Amino acid sequence: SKLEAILSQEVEAEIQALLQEAEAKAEAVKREAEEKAKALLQARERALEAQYRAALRRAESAGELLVATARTQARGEVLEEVRRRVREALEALPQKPEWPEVVRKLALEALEALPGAKALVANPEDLPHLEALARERGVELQAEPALRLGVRAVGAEGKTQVENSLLARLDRAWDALSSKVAQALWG
Amino acid sequence: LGLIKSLAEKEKQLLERLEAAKKEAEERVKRAEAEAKALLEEAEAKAKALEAQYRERERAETEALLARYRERAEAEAKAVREKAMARLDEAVALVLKEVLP
Ligand SMILES: [Ca+2]
Ligand SMILES: [Ca+2]
Ligand SMILES: [Ca+2]
Ligand SMILES: [Ca+2]
Ligand SMILES: [Ca+2]
């Protein structure tokens, strides 16, 4: 009958459509995976290039830091050599003709810092250089064998005391001095 | 009735036909899905090979670069000392001047 032919055609067309859609689906899935694979590899490569660049940039930063560390080390060693030479010169200074004058100047500065002082204290070898200066001021002179390269002033009856020492002057001022030196030498 | 027996037969062929069409459809799609999965797995592998190549090149270039810079560091240190030697005398007199009264 008519209905039977219609239904037979319905079954055929349902199967046909199932099969054509399955094929279209297969092709779409493959095409998609092709495009995805391609896009993935290209995106990845560009990302890799960028990373490699950053890697080289970090290495370079490391290298420059290494150069800066080297210059800072080298300056430091030079500065220490300067200090060593300064200390050797200061050590030799008491054998020189101008030592008495230096001693007198150190005593004056010690008195400026302790104007109430009643005595000046210096190494036994240095006292005779202060004799006249101390007499003019009216202050006593006292020997301290453990004392060198410096002069002490003492107030009261030993209540107060100020020291003017060349080595201690060097040591306390070295932080700033080293900056002045570096400007002179390099920067 | 032979009609009843042929109706049974016809039911049977309808079923086998629906089944056969469903299995062929499924196979087409499963085949494509597997081929797709292999395509993408292969692409990941190329990506990982390319990554490994970049990793090896990073190590090598970073080491060679830090070596060049160390050599530049050694030389720069030498330049520092050499340039200080010229004015050493002046530096020592400068400190002694600052430190003496
Ligand atoms: Ca037809
Ligand atoms: Ca037909
Ligand atoms: Ca047809
Ligand atoms: Ca003063
Ligand atoms: Ca000054």
Q: How far is CA A28 from the centre of its chain?
A: 64
Q: How close A20 comes to chain B (CA, Å)?
A: 9
Q: Where are the domains of chain A?
A: 1-96, 97-187
Give the right CATH number for A1-96 from 1.10.10.1100, 3.40.50.300, 1.20.5.620, 3.40.50.920: 1.20.5.620
3-state secondary structure B1-47: CHHHHHHHHHHHHHHHHHHHHHHHHHHHHHHHHHHHHHHHHHHHHHH
Which residues in chain A are contacts of B68 at CB distance < 8 A? 63
Tell the residue number behind the tokens 């459509």, with chain if given: A17
Residue A146: how many other CB atoms lie within 10 Å: 5
Do A130 and A120 meet the contact criterion of CB atoms below 8 Å apart?
A: yes
Experimental method reported for this structure = X-ray
Residue range(s) defining the domain that contains residue B12: 1-101
The sheet carrying A150-154 orders its strands as A140-143, A119-122, A150-154, A161-165
Do A60 and B63 meet the contact criterion of CB atoms below 8 Å apart?
A: no
Nearest Cα neighbor of B92 from A57, A70, A177, A143 is: A177
Which residues in chain A are contacts of B70 at CB distance < 8 A? 63, 66
Give the right CATH number for A97-187 from 3.40.50.300, 3.30.1490.20, 3.30.2320.30, 3.40.50.720: 3.30.2320.30
Specify the number of domains making up chain B: 1
Of all residues in chain B, the one with the smallest CA distance to A44 is B47
Closest in A26, A33, A86 to B31, CB measured: A26
Structure tokens that stand for A61 in this block = 């930063």
- C-alpha–C-alpha distance, residues B33 and B36, integer Å: 5
- C-alpha–C-alpha distance, residues A179 and A35, integer Å: 66
Structure tokens that stand for B45 in this block = 């592998």
- C-alpha–C-alpha distance, residues B26 and B33, integer Å: 10
Domain containing B80 — which CATH number? Answer: 1.20.5.2950
Do B54 and A48 meet the contact criterion of CB atoms below 8 Å apart?
A: yes
For ligand 3, the distance from its centroid to the CA atom of residue A1, given in whole angstroms, is: 19
- C-alpha–C-alpha distance, residues A171 and A70, integer Å: 25
The torsion of the CA quartet A94, A97, A101, A103, rounded to 10 degrees, works out to 10
Amino acid sitting at position B54: Y
**A63·B65 Cβ contact <8 A:** yes
A148 CB-near residues (< 8 Å, 6+ apart): A94, A123
